[PDB]
Design a protein around this ligand. Sequence first.
Ligand code: YE7
Ligand code: MN
Ligand code: NA
Length: 262
Amino acid sequence: AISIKTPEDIEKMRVAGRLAAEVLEMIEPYVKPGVSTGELDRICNDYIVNEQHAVSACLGYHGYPKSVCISINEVVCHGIPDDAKLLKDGDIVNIDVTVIKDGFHGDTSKMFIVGKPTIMGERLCRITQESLYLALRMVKPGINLREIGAAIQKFVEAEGFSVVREYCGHGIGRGFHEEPQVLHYDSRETNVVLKPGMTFTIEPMVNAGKKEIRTMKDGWTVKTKDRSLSAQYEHTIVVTDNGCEILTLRKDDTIPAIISHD
Ligand SMILES: NNC(=O)c1cn2ccc3ccccc3c2n1
Ligand SMILES: [Mn+2]
Ligand code: NA
C-alpha cells in the first residue's frame, strides 16, 4: 500500500531533501564549458560522503556505476558520468541527485545551461520546469494523480513538446522508488487520490521532438529516438493537510517551499 509518513519520518525527509538540493547548489559553479561529466560526478560524490556525511542512493542502485546521473542534450535520463565527455557551449545538462541520510531518500534534479544558451534550449528548460511547478501547485488531499499527469501533458504539448512515457515520478522514503507511480501524462490506469503524509516525486521528462526513446548499449543511457533535445526537473514533496511542502527546494527555485491552498 501507500505509506503515510510520520511527523518524525517527514522531518528526516526534510533533512535528506535539503542535502540533495544542496548538492545541486554546490555543483552549479563547476558546470561550465570544458569540464567532464566524470569529474562532476566525483565532485558530487566527495561532497555527499565527506561533507554531508550521507550516501548516494544511486551509486550501485540496481547496478548503476556512478553517484549521480548526468544527461546532456538528446540524452533523456540515466546518463553515465564519463571522464571523456566534456560539456560545451550551448549544452543543456541535467544532474540527477539522490541521497540517503538517516535511512531516508532525497530525490531531485535540475537543468543547467552551459556557456551561451540557445533560445530553444532555454525554452525547453523553462517550460519543463514550469510543467513541474504547475503540477506542484495542484498537489493537495483529494486530488487524483491522473489529474496532475493530465495537466502536465496538456501544458507540455501546447508548447509543441512531448512527454516521455517510460519514466515517472514515484513514492519515496526508506525506499528509493516506492508506490505510487506518478505519471506525467493522462493514463486510464491512473487512480490515486492524494492523502496528507504521502511523499513522492514529480519529475517530468520533456522532449523537444517526439516522445519515443532509445536505450544505448551500455545498458543505462537513454536518448530521444529522433535525437531531439530532452529536459527534466524534479522535486521531492510531502502532501500537507491542504497543499504540499517541497523538500528539495533550492535558492534558484522560483516557487515557495510551502504551497498552501487555504
Ligand atoms: N531522480 N531520478 C530518479 O528517480 C532516478 C535516478 N536514477 C539513477 C539510476 C537508476 C538506476 C536504476 C533505476 C532507477 C534509477 C534512477 N532513478
Ligand atoms: Mn526520482
Ligand atoms: Na537531455
